[PDB]
Amino acid sequence: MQNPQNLIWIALEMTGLDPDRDVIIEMATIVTDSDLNTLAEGPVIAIHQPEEILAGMDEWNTRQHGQSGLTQRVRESTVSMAEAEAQTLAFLEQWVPKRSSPICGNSICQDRRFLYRHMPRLEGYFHYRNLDVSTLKELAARWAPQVRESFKKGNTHLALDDIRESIAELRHYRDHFIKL
Amino acid sequence: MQNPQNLIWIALEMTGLDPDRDVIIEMATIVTDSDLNTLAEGPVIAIHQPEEILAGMDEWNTRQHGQSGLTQRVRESTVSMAEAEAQTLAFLEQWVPKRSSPICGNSICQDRRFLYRHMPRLEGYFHYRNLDVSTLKELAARWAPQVRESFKKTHLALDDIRESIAELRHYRDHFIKL
Ligand SMILES: [Mn+2]
Ligand SMILES: [Mn+2]
Known part of the structure; x- marks a missing residue:
């Protein structure tokens, strides 16, 4: 079912915003066709992290991941960073060829930085370009603010x-x- | 002549694809207004690097920066990374106030990552938004191939x-x- 024009959409949660200090704790993917129709929804994976990494989060991240339940999901998870990367790759390979899809979504430069550091095989599976919706948002703000x-x-x-x-x-x- | 709606366009050359392990060897900027009319062209700066860094480039970068003349320009440059950053900021400050413009160009996530590591004062001068022309390039390829x-x-x-x-x-x- 591979198609070189299908799009890979990703969303990550992290312990913080700095790839040198922080790690990925949740990942999710969706594959659409070129016209944004959903083809398949990927696995939503909570990535295990030891307690010292969980305690190393700042105030805002300890509160937000605690209150959302992600921290407990991470603590209980038996899926390592590498296993989550492999699980996601096995899903994406059914739908998109290697190096075909840009990373698609919002604020995906930050996502690319974290994938490059922590999941380099998944990062390398994407085309090097980003398809960031916020480029369209910026242009619309200037040239068609009503849009x-x-x-x-939504939620x-x-x-x-x-x-x-x-x-x-x-x-x-x-x-x-x-x-x- | 500062205007918070003006746009900073930037293009870098690097010794490789890894923002943390490789370095910047060329930079240039252009400022446009929000309607893409060119206001001023910034300095084009070759940034000096030690010979072992040039010798250490992979096959693609060795050939490309060799035959473009950049490798020789890097060797001959007496402008450090910090001096090139300061020269570019002195140009940009005349045209755009701090934190107002997105970083503008093709696949400029790559450029922002290199700036963040190697020229953080310049990286911090941009708004946090990226204006990535190649997002539109990819959309046009799929939705309007004629364009x-x-x-x-x-x-x-x-x-x-x-x-x-x-x-x-x-x-x-x-x-x-x-
Ligand atoms: Mn925003
Ligand atoms: Mn092209």
Whole structure:
């Protein structure tokens, strides 16, 4: 079912924003076709981390991951960083060839930095380009502000809804900002 | 002549693809207004590096920076990474206030990562947004292949940035609905 024009959408949670200090603790993927129709929803994986890494989180991250239950999911998880990378790759290979899809979503430069450091095989599976919806948001803010303000950002508390809202944002810009 | 809506376009050359293990060897900038009209071209700067760093480049970078003349320019340069950062900031400060402009160009996540490691004062001068022309390039390839062929695309740094601006102008005129 591989297709070189299918898009890989990703969402990550981390202990913090610095790849040298921090690690990935949750990952999720969705594969769409070129026209943003969902083909398959990938595994949502809580990645195990030892207690000292969990205690090393700052105040905002200890509170947010604690209150969301992710911290307890991470503590209980029996899936290592490398195993989660392999689990995600096994899913994506059924749908997208290697080096075909850019990383798609929002704030994905930060995602690429974390994948490069902690999941280099998955990072290398993407095309080197980023498909970041926020480029369209920035251009719309300048050239068509009404399109940016008419986007209704739904709930993104959980990982698949988070990705789906990024797909919906791009879909919004295709319907109202892109000439076709 | 500062304007918070002006755009900083940047293009770097590096010794390799790893922002943490490799280094910057060339930089250039151009400032446009928010409607992509060029206001000023910044300095094009070859950044000195020790010979072992040049000798250590992989096969692709050894050939490409060799035949472009950059390898010789890096050897002959007396401008350090920090001096090149300061020269570029002195140009940009005349045109854009701090934190106002996104980083603008093709696949500029790569450039921002190198700046963050090697020229953090300059990296910090940008807004946190990335304006990535190659996001539109990929979208146009899949949704409007005719628009990607309409644009005819340069080893000189300022030519490279001019072509990134012209590529965005092409999408604004033939891909985006205003
Ligand atoms: Mn924002
Ligand atoms: Mn091209």
